[PDB]
Ligand binder design. Structure first.
Ligand SMILES: COc1ccc2cc3[n+](cc2c1OC)CCc1cc2c(cc1-3)OCO2
Ligand SMILES: COc1ccc2cc3[n+](cc2c1OC)CCc1cc2c(cc1-3)OCO2
Ligand SMILES: COc1ccc2cc3[n+](cc2c1OC)CCc1cc2c(cc1-3)OCO2
Ligand SMILES: COc1ccc2cc3[n+](cc2c1OC)CCc1cc2c(cc1-3)OCO2
Ligand code: PRO
Ligand code: PRO
Ligand code: PRO
Ligand code: PRO
Ligand code: PRO
Ligand code: PRO
Ligand code: PRO
Ligand code: PRO
Ligand code: PRO
Lengths: 559, 557
């Protein structure tokens, strides 16, 4: 027979505390909190200026390259945080907010999974506290003011063909990828090519997550480059007098959102940019908030260590002035056997030979964390019942040779109890740890030197090649004065290389850069190794067709 | 003696919204808080409480003039006045669109000392209803295009797609677009456009639904296109309405807010008054009548548009009947109808006041003699209004059997509305159930149009273009001839000619176009061009908007 519980059944049967009690666990009075129902809350960012910082530790959760087998990065983050709570520690989980668009294409999902989730699950997947709407409104206001300026006088001499700013919407709408607007009468605007991204891909989202306060948000938004003039110089949102209004739309959204786990552990969800064209981390203001209110903060970055962790350490940690005390590298035996050449169908059979072929992927990410950034790390293996004792022993052997212990995580089935082993090793790394954190590169280096450093040190590439047009675009960015910013490499996440088919630990390859541009608002240069989907489409049978509401207003079909 | 509306709003002491909910017998478990000054009310509270069967007070006005009339200020003021008189009362109002705030600055819900607070939050995101309306609108658009891109098994003709996308911005750039460009995987190339979010039919259907079940059903009946066989394709055909109602599940809960004097207020919905009915949502008015003894609501654009549609559309679908009608006007506005220039409105001009008074008199006749509802004229008094001017207006209105009450709510708060509120209470106790619609649902579209044009506007009849006739003919064949008609004409005149002030007589209505809003449940009829997406000014008000280091917004008002 069978008997099992889906994540939504686990979320339904939960007993979530009043968010006011959750706030009490981190010394947040009722007068420091804006309630959104009794299970969601927004935290005033002005509590930092009137309370004493606990100077909590920072625990960064990452993973190997994503595989169709799944690794359970966010489930481990929530589970380890719950474990530290079982150990009597004052801990906060810092996570991102999901986009709403994909819920209607491919269905929504739990914050984590199993018994390591964040609740309320339904609200988190939909409107939550409205941050996504605030991001999009600010994005589209700047777009309307840009087009309005060109329509009224165009005194800034904006070249319509060099307009880089794009509108956005929080839906999976392929139809809006490439558009032409401004058609009609003379009074209907100026005809030009345009496009829509999904809201989370907007640069507003990136700068939103890299602002320390509302004044830095207003300053970052003004630095956004929306076009170039006929002289080749950048035209910014500040030049349009737009950043003040955009900061007014985001005034409430910039407050971090307080929720909880299934075990009552305080959780903060805030922001959620891409992990290829952005850094893929939750907001700085939320991570700073947590370290100010708790002794431990468990956060995470998307797409695995070669992308999210690299940008957490080289972009976020630089702009926030923070240092991880420990790093959790998540992996599963099935994912490693997948790197070894096993097809997705056969990942449940024992295959020591394939596990050994795919282990160099985990080994490379360990070397990057512990030998390039010099940060104490622990491997968290999300154990499955078919994981043989030899498979676990082989993984532990090769990881011990690099000085890293392997802790078995069972938070998906046992909640915080299943994360005590990982939590204990993390506390051990924090106490026995020293400040050896090193960036992958220095800011004074050129854009090509920074890319060369990341490709060689992190990806394992022999070097970086540039197309004819990429070299031109990088040369312009150096001339305009952007060569002193961090670089954000937008490449595939399924491989250490830029070739999504090269599993394991590819060697003797080169990265092919074909496009580059400036995200002056977020504060980094974006570099492309291929086409990047900034607006997903809907499948043939969208998930929306099964979503329903009953006479009492209960939603079904979401998960 | 006092300051601007934003300064009055800042110097106000709003109570905790939980205490405001206590005034209308709402427990803490009936209330979702959005800070301690806003709250959403569960619409299931109706299913566990006994209805107080409260009275319905409709607030309308004369045709909007550049002089202003202060309609919403009077509604809030009369609501505060009934509170001063120890009555249990709720003010039901509309939510403002956030878009125009960044063009022509924001404004108060009301004005003077008759406001609704928080003013700042109401002008922006409020509780997110506008975002949900747009999300539901844009999901249906994405699923419509996806179906055509995938299989188009419904044989949708892209040249017959009527659904439009939306955004809550004043963006003239998105009026006419071509989307679907790019690779073969980037969609189907076609012409398209955007409207401001509050102009979506999702907004009108949102406001004409009695419960979450009718919302899902109404959303399903929305016509999004036509197949090559000429038959309507709906959102139900796309299996979208269940998902759209899920996006709106929390939005459909009315928003509990308060006035300056602590009176409970509900702001929910905000459709256009020309291409829609311009009323707050039916659930908000039902909720108020369920939880209180008196409800003051309003309709936009004066009696010939909002009040007409409030009575012939909203009242029909909700099954409610107004117990009294407040017709708001000013001496300045009537003298404007009499031929006085905008700059000369401060001098006494009894001759021009008599030339413009027929406008107010026609609206009285429609309320009291066509719909048969008791009415009272509320004059928002100005300091330079001579006693003779006020006496002339009182004279002509009493010839029709309607008292004139002087309103000073703007400068005096609820005290300034006691005179109006008293006549409203007198009209409710002495009134009878004589309410009649202007037309019956059985009549054809052109008969329903001829009924409104002649009885309400004062026209000799209705003329139709060739294209208007074909569209009306096609709407009859498809089976939409049984719905009400929502006439979209100018608000500055009883006629379809914005220059004909006062009380025009020898005119006829020209219909250029007819469309179907099957989700809202009415047929829209055009007399001219309708701007569903306004543009930003040369100097947008958003350039003056700023935020300080503590997160305080300036320049909004
Ligand atoms: C989202 O992440 C997930 C999602 C799903 C997961 C499912 C399972 N596990 C981790 C998961 C995980 O973490 C890696 C490991 C324990 C387990 C035992 C089982 C089983 C499934 C799983 O089927 C029968 O016995
Ligand atoms: C306890 O065992 C340990 C402890 C510490 C170890 C440290 C390192 N390694 C193994 C270790 C090990 O396993 C043998 C492998 C090579 C290496 C290169 C590096 C580095 C550290 C290490 O920093 C920068 O470059
Ligand atoms: C794969 O199946 C598909 C996929 C997409 C299809 C798209 C269209 N049609 C069949 C399709 C079909 O069936 C053969 C025929 C009706 C039509 C009219 C149009 C149009 C595209 C289509 O663009 C403008 O006017
Ligand atoms: C029943 O009659 C029909 C039925 C189906 C018809 C389908 C199409 N057209 C007329 C039709 C018609 O004419 C009256 C012409 C426009 C068109 C563009 C297209 C397409 C199909 C069609 O596929 C892709 O681009
Ligand atoms: O644009 C300005 O004048 C300043 C610079 C940072 C925030 N606003
Ligand atoms: O000790 C650390 O590494 C972090 C840095 C910011 C405060 N605590
Ligand atoms: O490596 C660097 O340049 C800085 C020093 C503190 C941490 N990272
Ligand atoms: O179908 C689309 O429009 C995109 C591109 C391929 C996968 N999803
Ligand atoms: O109505 C309000 O909310 C304004 C703005 C803050 C103080 N008073
Ligand atoms: O079937 C079609 O026509 C579109 C294009 C690829 C899959 N869906
Ligand atoms: O979707 C694609 O990739 C093909 C190639 C160009 C036209 N469409
Ligand atoms: O209209 C409705 O509500 C249902 C949904 C599927 C078809 N009929
Ligand atoms: O499109 C509009 O609404 C304004 C009016 C003239 C200039 N643009």
């Amino acid at each position: 027979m069978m008997e099992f519980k889906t994540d939504i059944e686990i979320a339904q049967e939960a007993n979530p505390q009043d968010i006011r009690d959750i706030a009490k666990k981190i010394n947040l009075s009722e007068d420091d909190i804006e309630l959104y129902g009794k299970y969601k809350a927004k935290i005033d960012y002005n509590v930092l200026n009137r309370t004493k910082s606990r100077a909590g530790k920072l625990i960064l959760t990452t993973a190997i390259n994503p595989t169709p087998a799944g690794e359970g990065k966010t489930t481990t983050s929530i589970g380890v945080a719950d474990a530290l709570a079982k150990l009597g520690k004052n801990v906060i989980a810092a996570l991102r907010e999901p986009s709403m668009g994909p819920v209607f294409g491919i269905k929504g999902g739990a914050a984590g999974g199993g018994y390591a989730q964040v609740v309320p699950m339904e609200d988190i997947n939909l409107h939550f506290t409205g941050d996504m709407h605030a991001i999009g409104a600010a994005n589209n206001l700047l777009a309307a003011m840009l087009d309005n300026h060109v329509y009224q006088t165009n005194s800034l001499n904006i070249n319509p063909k060099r307009i880089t700013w794009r509108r956005c919407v929080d839906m999976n709408d392929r139809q809006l990828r490439n558009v032409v607007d401004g058609l009609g009468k003379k009074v209907d605007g100026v005809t030009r090519e345009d496009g829509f991204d999904i809201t989370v891909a907007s640069e507003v989202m990136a700068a939103f997550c890299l602002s320390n306060n509302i004044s830095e948000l207003k300053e970052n938004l003004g630095n956004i480059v929306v076009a170039y003039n006929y002289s080749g110089k950048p035209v910014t949102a500040r030049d349009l007098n737009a950043h003040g209004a955009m900061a007014a739309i985001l005034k409430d959204a910039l407050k971090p959102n307080l929720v909880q786990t299934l075990e009552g552990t305080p959780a903060i969800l805030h922001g959620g940019p891409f992990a290829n064209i952005a850094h893929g981390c939750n907001s700085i203001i939320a991570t700073k908030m947590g370290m100010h209110m708790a002794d431990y903060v468990v956060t995470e970055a998307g797409f695995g260590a070669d992308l999210g962790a690299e940008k957490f350490l080289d972009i976020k940690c630089r702009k926030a002035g923070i240092r991880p005390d420990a790093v959790i590298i998540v992996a599963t035996v099935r994912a490693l056997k997948y790197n070894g050449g096993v097809a997705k169908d056969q990942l449940n059979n024992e295959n020591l030979e394939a596990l050994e072929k795919g282990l160099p992927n985990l080994l490379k990410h360990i070397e990057n964390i512990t030998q390039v950034y010099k940060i104490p790390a622990v491997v968290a293996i999300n154990r499955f019942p078919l994981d043989t004792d030899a498979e676990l022993a082989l993984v532990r052997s090769k990881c011990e040779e690099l000085g890293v212990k392997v802790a078995l995580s069972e938070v998906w089935a046992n909640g915080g109890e299943g994360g005590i082993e990982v939590a204990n090793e993390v506390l051990k790394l924090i106490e026995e740890g020293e400040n050896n954190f090193e960036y992958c590169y220095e800011e004074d280096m050129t854009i090509k030197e920074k890319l060369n450093a990341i490709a060689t040190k992190i990806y394992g590439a022999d070097g970086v090649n540039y197309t004819k047009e990429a070299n031109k675009q990088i040369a312009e960015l150096e001339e305009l004065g952007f060569g002193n910013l961090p670089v954000c490499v937008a490449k595939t996440q399924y491989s250490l290389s830029d070739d999504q088919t090269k599993l394991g630990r590819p060697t003797g390859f080169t990265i092919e850069v074909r496009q580059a541009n400036i995200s002056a608002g977020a504060g980094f240069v974006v570099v492309m190794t291929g086409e990047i989907m900034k607006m997903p489409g809907l499948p043939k049978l969208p998930a929306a067709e099964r979503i329903d509401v009953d006479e009492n207003g209960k939603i079904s079909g979401l998960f």
